[PDB]
Amino acid sequence: VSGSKKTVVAFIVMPAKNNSFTVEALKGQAEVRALENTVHEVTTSIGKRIFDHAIRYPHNGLTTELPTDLGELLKSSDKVMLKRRILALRRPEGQLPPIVTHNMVDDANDLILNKIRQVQLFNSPSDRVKMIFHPEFLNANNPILGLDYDEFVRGCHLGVFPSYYEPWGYTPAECTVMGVPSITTNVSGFGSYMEDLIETNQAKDYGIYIVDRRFKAPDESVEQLVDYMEEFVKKTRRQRIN
């Protein structure tokens, strides 16, 4: 609606019975690797040629200090192999970037997945919000995403843990310690404790977003949460950092 150019990848890290990773997410990553490797070879070839031109100038009728036409740097067998890499990257007609990383055991009756489909966030070029459900605890040995949970946390921009029953919740707290801003509910123990210690409108400048899940309807809550989420998506880099 607002015509925003931002995007939001949104991750779900929760353990669910599974048979390890999908051959799609594994093959995918491997194919992106092959491309980088190839880009390295091709930039090495460029380097030789850039460098040679640079050394030989002005001699042998070179008129410019630098190459000016990309055909001097990029060649036949270069473009040939590079395209092969782009080819093996492209996915089947109208096939769309999954919402699971793993082969679920009971994908049919899975609440998270069933909810996503019900909301129809299937990751389409037009969707400004993407969904990736990782049904496994994060460990830096996992072949598609080699991060330990906490490392990942450091990497993310915002932590959304809109709880109903959560007597403390280390999750939003850990998050706060790694200096990541979080959305938590006033019915979560942590959220409760933080709601008290600072005035509520202030706590938004401290990345502590408390949603009212108590003195508000289960559809006023959801709106307050989007009021938060969308406020965050408005912030600049300068603002995100500070």
Ligand X SMILES: O=P(O)(O)OC[C@H]1O[C@H](O)[C@H](O)[C@@H](O)[C@@H]1O
Q: What is the radius of gyration, based on Cα positions, of the chain? A: 24
Looking at the Cβ atoms of 63 and 236, the one nearer to ligand X is 236
Q: What residues numbered 156-215 form the site for ligand X, per CB under 6 A?
A: 157
> Least CB distance from residue 134 to ligand U5P, whole Å?
8
> Least CB distance from residue 170 to ligand U5P, whole Å?
4
Out of ligand U5P, its own copies, ligand X, none, which partner does residue 57 contact, by CB within 5 to 8 A per kind?
A: its own copies
List Cβ neighbours of 99 (8 Å cut-off, separation of 6 or more). Answer: 113, 116, 121, 122, 123, 131, 132, 133
Q: Do residues 83 and 75 lie in contact, with contact meaning Cβ atoms separated by under 8 Å?
A: no
> Least CB distance from residue 5 to ligand X, whole Å?
14
Looking at the Cβ atoms of 6 and 83, the one nearer to ligand X is 6
Interface residues toward ligand U5P, by CB under 6 A: 13, 137-138, 149, 169-171, 174
Among residues 23, 80, 197, 241, the one that binds ligand X under rule CB under 6 A: 241
- Which amino acid does the sequence have at 31? E
DSSP helix, strand, coil percent of the chain (3-state; round to 5): 40, 15, 45
Looking at the Cβ atoms of 66 and 140, the one nearer to ligand U5P is 140
Per-residue DSSP letter, 188: B
Strands (E), 94-128: 102-104
Looking at the Cβ atoms of 26 and 129, the one nearer to its own copies is 26
